[PDB]
Amino acid sequence: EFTVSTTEDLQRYRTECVSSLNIPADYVEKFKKWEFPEDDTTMCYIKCVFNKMQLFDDTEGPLVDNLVHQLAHGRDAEEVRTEVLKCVDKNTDNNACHWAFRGFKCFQKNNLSLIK
Ligand SMILES: [Cl-]
C-alpha cells in the first residue's frame, strides 16, 4: 500500500542516500540549492531518492499511479496523470540511474515538485 511522502520523509531519504552512496560534500551543497549535474553521482542519487519514495523501480521504471498521488499537490488527478505519462519512457539505454534522472528532468520541466 503506497502512501504519499511528507517533507520529513523526503529529508530523511536524501540523508540516507547521501550516506549510502557516499555523496561528496560539494554535491550535497549543489543538491541543497537544487543544482543537479548530469553525471552518474547525481543520477544514482536521484534514483536512490525515487526508490525510497516508491516512485521508481529499477526494472519496471516510473511507478505512474504513485507519482500521480505524490506530485498532484491539489491539482486534477487526470491532468497530473497525463503530464506524468508524457515523462514515462522505456529503459532505452539500459541504465536505471540514467532512467530515473530522465524522468526527474521531465517532471522539473513541467513544474511537478515532490513537495508543494
Ligand atoms: Cl530530490
Domain boundaries, the chain: 1-116
Resolution, angstroms, 1 dp: 1.9
Q: Are 113 and 73 in contact (CB under 8 A)?
A: yes
Cell numbers for 82: 497525463
Known binder of ligand: residue 45?
yes
Alpha helices in 1-116 (DSSP H): 7-20, 25-32, 40-52, 64-71, 77-87, 96-109
Sorted by sequence, the CB contacts under 8 Å of residue 101 that are 6+ apart come out as 36, 38, 42, 43, 46, 47
3-state DSSP assignment of residue 57:
strand
* Gap between the Cα atoms of 32 and 109, Å rounded: 19
13 is annotated as contributing to ligand binding: no
User: Scanning the structure block, which residue is given the C-alpha cell 542516500?
Assistant: 17
Tell me the three cell numbers of residue 96.
Answer: 536505471
Cα of 24 to ligand 1 centre, how many Å? 16
Residue 46 CA to ligand 1 centre (angstroms): 6
How remote is the CA of residue 31 from the centroid of ligand 1, in Å? 8
Q: SS3 of 36, please?
A: coil
Cα–Cα dist 108/60, whole Å: 21
HSE (side-chain half, CA atoms, 13 Å) at 79: 9
Distance 1 CA to ligand 1 centre (A): 22
DSSP state of 111: T
Residue 114 CA to ligand 1 center (angstroms) comes to: 7
Joined together, the cell numbers standing for residue 83 give: 503530464
Q: Residue type at 60?
A: E
Contact 110, 87 (CB under 8 A): yes
DSSP structural state of residue 31: H
Q: What is the distance in A from the centroid of ligand 1 to the CA of 104? A: 8
User: From CA 89, how far away is CA 56, in angstroms rounded?
Assistant: 12
Determined by: X-ray
| Å from CA of 78 to ligand 1 middle | 24
